[PDB]
Design a binder for this molecule. Sequence first.
Ligand SMILES: CCCCCCCCCCCCC/C=C\[C@H](O)[C@H](N)CO
Ligand SMILES: CCCCCCCCCCCCC/C=C\[C@H](O)[C@H](N)CO
Ligand SMILES: *C(=O)CCCCCCCCCCCCC
Ligand SMILES: *C(=O)CCCCCCCCCCCCC
Lengths: 60, 60, 5, 5, 268, 268, 136, 56, 283, 283
Amino acid sequence: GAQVSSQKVGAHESTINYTTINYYRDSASNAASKQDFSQDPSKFTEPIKDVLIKTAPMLN
Amino acid sequence: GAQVSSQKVGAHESTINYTTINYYRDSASNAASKQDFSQDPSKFTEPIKDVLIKTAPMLN
Amino acid sequence: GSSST
Amino acid sequence: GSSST
Amino acid sequence: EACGYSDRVLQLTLGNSTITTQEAANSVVAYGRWPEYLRDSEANPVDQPTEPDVAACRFYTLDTVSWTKESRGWWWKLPDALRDMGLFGQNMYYHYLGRSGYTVHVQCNASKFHQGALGVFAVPEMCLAGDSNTTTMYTSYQNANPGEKGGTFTGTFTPDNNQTSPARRFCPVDYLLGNGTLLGNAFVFPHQIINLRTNNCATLVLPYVNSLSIDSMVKHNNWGIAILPLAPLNFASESSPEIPITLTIAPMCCEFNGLRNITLPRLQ
Amino acid sequence: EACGYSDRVLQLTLGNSTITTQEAANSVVAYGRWPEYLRDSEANPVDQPTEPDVAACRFYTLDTVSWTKESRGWWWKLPDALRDMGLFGQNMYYHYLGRSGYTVHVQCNASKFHQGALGVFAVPEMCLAGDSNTTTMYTSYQNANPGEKGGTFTGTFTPDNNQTSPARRFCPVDYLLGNGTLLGNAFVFPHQIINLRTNNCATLVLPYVNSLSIDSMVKHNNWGIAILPLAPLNFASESSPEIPITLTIAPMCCEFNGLRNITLPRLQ
Amino acid sequence: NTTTMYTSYQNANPGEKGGTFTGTFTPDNNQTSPARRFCPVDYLLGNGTLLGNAFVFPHQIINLRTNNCATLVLPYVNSLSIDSMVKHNNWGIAILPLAPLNFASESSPEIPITLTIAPMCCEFNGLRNITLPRLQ
Amino acid sequence: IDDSFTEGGYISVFYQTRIVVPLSTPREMDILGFVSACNDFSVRLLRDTTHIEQKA
Amino acid sequence: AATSRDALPNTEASGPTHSKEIPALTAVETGATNPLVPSDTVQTRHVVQHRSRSESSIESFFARGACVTIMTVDNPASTTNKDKLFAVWKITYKDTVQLRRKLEFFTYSRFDMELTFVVTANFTETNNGHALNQVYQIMYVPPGAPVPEKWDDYTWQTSSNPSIFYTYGTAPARISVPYVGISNAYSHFYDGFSKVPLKDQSAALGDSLYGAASLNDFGILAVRVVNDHNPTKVTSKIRVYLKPKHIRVWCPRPPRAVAYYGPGVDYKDGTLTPLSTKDLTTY
Amino acid sequence: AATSRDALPNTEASGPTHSKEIPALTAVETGATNPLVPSDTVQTRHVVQHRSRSESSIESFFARGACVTIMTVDNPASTTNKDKLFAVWKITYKDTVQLRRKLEFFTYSRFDMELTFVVTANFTETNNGHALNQVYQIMYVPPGAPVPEKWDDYTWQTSSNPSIFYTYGTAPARISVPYVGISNAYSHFYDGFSKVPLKDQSAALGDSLYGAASLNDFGILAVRVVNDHNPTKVTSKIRVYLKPKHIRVWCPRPPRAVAYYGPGVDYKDGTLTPLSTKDLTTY
Ligand SMILES: CCCCCCCCCCCCC/C=C\[C@H](O)[C@H](N)CO
Ligand SMILES: CCCCCCCCCCCCC/C=C\[C@H](O)[C@H](N)CO
Ligand SMILES: *C(=O)CCCCCCCCCCCCC
Ligand SMILES: *C(=O)CCCCCCCCCCCCC
């Protein structure tokens, strides 16, 4: 049940990996993976009904 | 001898699993798996000799 | 080895 | 066994 | 059924005895388990068991009691209530060990103008509370075991204040089910209700229940039968109505081990 | 059915409401037509209809009336009787147009020793006769529309002689069905009879009936409910028996058109 | 500043008339019969955060030289799928002058602001008798 | 526990018509009521009860 | 195959009804509970149910250590007139009330038992003397084995009895024990006696307590401070926590509604009125 | 598939422009922010961008234990007139300010909660007496369960409530808790009341606090020293650290700009001027 993931190696001395085994039944007990996703800011930066083309006039 | 089971993941950050190894000869020393079964309440809620059909009269 | 549930 | 990411 | 069969009309036959009823409310099989003989994989005493079959697995009728507006309720213990019943009782007292299931048939008819409702409960290990606040767990064997006459519930706890010669009997308070738990919850035990407008009887088929495959019937009661008026007897405008309650009980799949001379208990 | 199902025992469920009965005489569907929404081929107002569904198509119980030996009969109009009933009434007064069908359940139980028979009639366009012989067609909107309290029938026609301030109400004579036709013929309208020895209720399922697909519910009543004692109440040897009559009515497949501000009618 | 979280239901819920923002916080000093109303200071967005950041909320600006209206389509937002509308407000509409009204050289110009709002995809559960709230 | 935010509402019973009896019959009687959970019912966050204690 | 953490059944959408099917009408005399669901009596929508009964499985309901006793011991100056206190406790879940009430929702049970020991100590006399770190001996003395009469007598050798030597200030001690009953299940209630009174025998001779089976059901724990006497007296307490692991239960019972009064089901006068005043037509 | 640790976009080289394309001109009335990048308004070179937003992911921004409370307890001489102090704390992140402000960048959140407990003790009277090592009991009492009235009453049995027995001087205690909300997310802001005031009811009867939902939202922690009274009094403090693990957040908000004043959004007179003087044309 071991999970093997790669580290993003910053300062250097192949891929360096690290290992993780969950010891508990409850997922709440797990550490944080930090394997997170990004999204586009559009729902906040461009919430307009008609798609914005930045080279065009915003008002036409 | 490792046992690998899945966690029911509640709050999220695939299947997340966890690992279990029993360290002792006596099953009494084992932790609780919590992998438990449910049953129908009928032996207490419907202990009648003739099967009950809920849309029908209980007395006929 | 490993059991899996 | 082992998962790999 | 289109050929006339009904939930309300039943016939039960065990040994040389038959019960009929025309106003049943179906019948209950406690925990969905029909009585059975002890299986080899669960067996414990190794001697050949005695299994009296029809000689003991037949309907025995106990003494009829009377329901009135002041009745608080009645109780019996099994096998105790049947200890003097024909060859069942003999088989019981001749053997160290015995196990048995039961068909319990409570009988109480009245009329379309009477009303009232009896809760009929079968309780596994029906431990009742004693009359004492000077000594706990003090109810004597003789008082714990009334035989067929049974015992009664009371609406009032009254502590035995005679310290010199204590009564040593139960004081089973009705809303506390005689054991310190609320009567409204007794329905989690296998039960039926005799509600006079609906039915004139209760039928409970009880498996042998215990933390052992077989045990001392003389030392230990497996089941308790508790009958309490959930709704009081009432009739027309009479102030003092009465209707009888009769218990008929049949042992089922009973077997006994450890034969010797007969037990002669101190019952008074 | 061999599984126990009966003509006499029914359960009706509409929205968050359920009616049960154990002494029905089947139920009636007026003219064999179940209620329906307005079809596109018969549609007339073109705006999107409002269809409140469970918010209005549910059982509303009106004020209980009392049946006695001197009762001559009662009447209600639909939709008028339901004009103040929860979201049905709101939907009605907010829209120019509305149409609706109904399940009408009249309730009246007694005992095996009582007797009497109520004719329960659902009449399309139940125009009633006025109290005047000085001015015809003069019953005021307020008197024509009692709301849930309904109105009553009388055994006697009595003309309003106040010419200065006329009563302007109906004077519906019972053997003339309140409209100048003989009551013995009212059975050509969808009906049931509550005959106490037989049944304790009447159930009539009414389709929307009209010479139009939809209309002003506030100006026009589609159905009238008329309840008359065909055989008078009687009990044991009491001179003044009473039993209650309760009406519970549910709108069915109701839809509304022409939304605007709410109508605030002059009802007194 | 004598009792926190004390704004009464009646004052929290003005209905259609709404409420207003103020440029000045003034604490209710009547301790015997407290006003029990909001004191929403404008540069603090009525809630203790700076107004210049309110643009992280869904917004539009009515800048008179450019446009004469704002249109915001709001989804139902909540930590639950459905809730008590009578106990709880899901959205607040806040309108503040980012640049003050001005006209020609009149000292006291006025122009009207009208709100028109339409419910969308609304559904209700738990029907009973009608709620009759204490609103004053 | 009693909590306004998670209040459940109101259970009540009314006479729809009335109880009717013939002569020679009791004019008053009892009804009994029972409550139970449906198959969609669940509980969570285990805790100690206030329904028993042990003072001293 | 239905597991405790499975989602409960979905609500299926259901519409209006007008038929001879009567789910709402029933007859509780039969002894059965009417198996209804909302779509039987009202109009429902389709709901995809996610909730589960995982936390109310028998295992989860009991998966907590409960305090069942507090044992007191000490280690006095050698010069004291009073003997060094060692503790003896008859193992039971009935000296406290909370776990007892939970187990008593059922008539019988089977489980492996986990015992955890929390140990605390303090000074008693307004002295200024110190004491070095204490080691405690928790010895299980099963029915039949010699119970210690003195803090230092031969029984504390433990050649065959299991003992825990616990060091103060370390993690609380813990052991597991299998299902050790002499029956196929533990009896939470025994409606009987351990003796039959015979006619030919005196009443005293045939007598025994109601509801009591083996006098020494499970034996005792005997606890001592192993350290020799110290000039300054220290008193310690050993709190015992019981957790039923791997549990099975049979025959449900109404819970205890009035205060416990002894190891049996007896009740005390003046404690029999649990319920409070509330008016029939008051919400 | 774009991850938090991925490099941000490269700058693409761009040259001179003379066209009808007008990236620089926009109209903020629309409610949108102009999505420009340097090559839209100046000449750029090609740059291979290596920087990432890994440390500002919601998880990373919150991946720290923050102190949310300090609980005080003690263990006095038995002879004292004052009761032995045990602590009771209503669980919340609003007694301190730093984690509160971070969570309040958002309207709603979901997370698993990690609680870490740091425990320190000291002597108070200018005595010379000692105290043996203390064990602490941290009991979670969820809404409805009996709150302890005395350091030693029956509730500390914990048959069903979760408790931590912590030994002084050992590693700080730590537990995890799942997302336990009764809503689909935690509400950092609730614009409403827990009661509707009805006309037919008195104002007192319909009243409730603004913005407050369940009175006892999450229950309390009750902490005690398990050791018996000691001649020399020791006072201890339990510092509680909260870390939101596995977190999700919704609906961004402007951060708190003036001092917190209570659990709501209220502010205090005299604290409303965060900004400082700076002249419009002064760098
Ligand atoms: C070094 C420490 C070892 C401790 C060993 C303890 C062994 C004894 C186990 C006792 C089991 C108690 C179970 C509870 C009680 C029973 O259920 C009922 N009174 C019925 O039999
Ligand atoms: C043995 C120690 C166990 C401790 C168990 C703690 C359980 C209670 C968890 C509380 C969760 C608090 C989350 C923060 C606050 C809420 O977000 C907001 N006020 C909105 O609901
Ligand atoms: C998957 O986990 C199979 C490989 C197992 C590797 C060794 C596990 C190391 C110890 C884990 C103990 C269990 C934790 C409760
Ligand atoms: C099955 O267990 C084979 C895999 C072994 C994995 C590593 C075991 C980790 C250490 C266990 C030690 C033994 C416990 C007494």
